[PDB]
């Protein structure tokens, strides 16, 4: 039988699996698309909240 | 010379089989030269050896041989049937096989 009253699904399915991180420092998966015009500079930094 | 081979190389294809039942008594050999039963008809009487190696040395050597003979042609692609004294192991499908020229008729 169909769901009597529609409702949006709970939670977000694109963040699965909800396991622990591999390490206490999250990896920067992607980096800004490099262009070879501006001077050389870092694309990130590390800090402590 | 650097080549001492006196046998034609061949590949052990499979046991004679229907769609779902295989007969281990008769094996199939694909000889590297023949490509038609007319050319396969030459090799019918020839002796066949499967040569393998084992870790235990018996009767003077670690190399053992299972002997057999070609029996008749198979199909239109020159495959031949082979009958061995003891049937070839099913692990040797695609293994190499020496088809000697004896007995000869030329």
């Amino acid at each position: 039988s169909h769901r009597k009253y529609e409702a949006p699904r709970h939670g977000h399915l694109g963040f699965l699996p909800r396991k622990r991180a591999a390490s206490i420092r999250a990896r920067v998966k992607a980096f800004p698309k490099d262009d070879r015009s501006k001077p050389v500079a870092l694309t990130s930094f590390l800090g402590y909240k | 010379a650097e080549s001492h081979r006196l046998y034609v190389k061949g590949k052990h294809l499979s046991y004679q089989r229907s769609k779902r039942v295989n007969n281990p008594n008769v094996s199939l050999i694909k000889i590297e030269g023949v490509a038609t039963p007319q050319d396969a008809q030459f090799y019918l009487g020839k002796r066949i050896a499967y040569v393998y190696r084992a870790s235990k040395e018996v009767r003077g050597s670690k190399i053992r041989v299972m002997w057999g003979k070609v029996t008749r042609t198979h199909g239109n692609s020159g495959v031949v049937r082979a009958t061995f004294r003891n049937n070839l192991p099913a692990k040797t499908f695609g293994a190499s096989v020496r088809i000697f020229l004896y007995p000869s008729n030329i």
Binding site: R25, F31, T43, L46, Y48 | -
Partner: protein
Amino acid sequence: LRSLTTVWAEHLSDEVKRRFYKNWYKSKKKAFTKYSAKYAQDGAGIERELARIKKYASVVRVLVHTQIRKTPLAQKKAHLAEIQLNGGSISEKVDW
């Protein structure tokens, strides 16, 4: 993308050498000994490696670490991370 080679600095701080051990208090602290000895004789191997990086390196990332001893945190083991250099060509990045 696959890493080709990493070239380290001659002298590594204690707070970043700690990252390479789990038991720093009793370790012999031998990390990068036979590598800091490679910077001797004007670092011929080091410059050769950098030249090979320039020859075959499409993306350049730099290993850096935080001076965590400057923070009030109790942990003295620094964090090491790769930050991509965005700028001139590969030679400019590695020279920088």
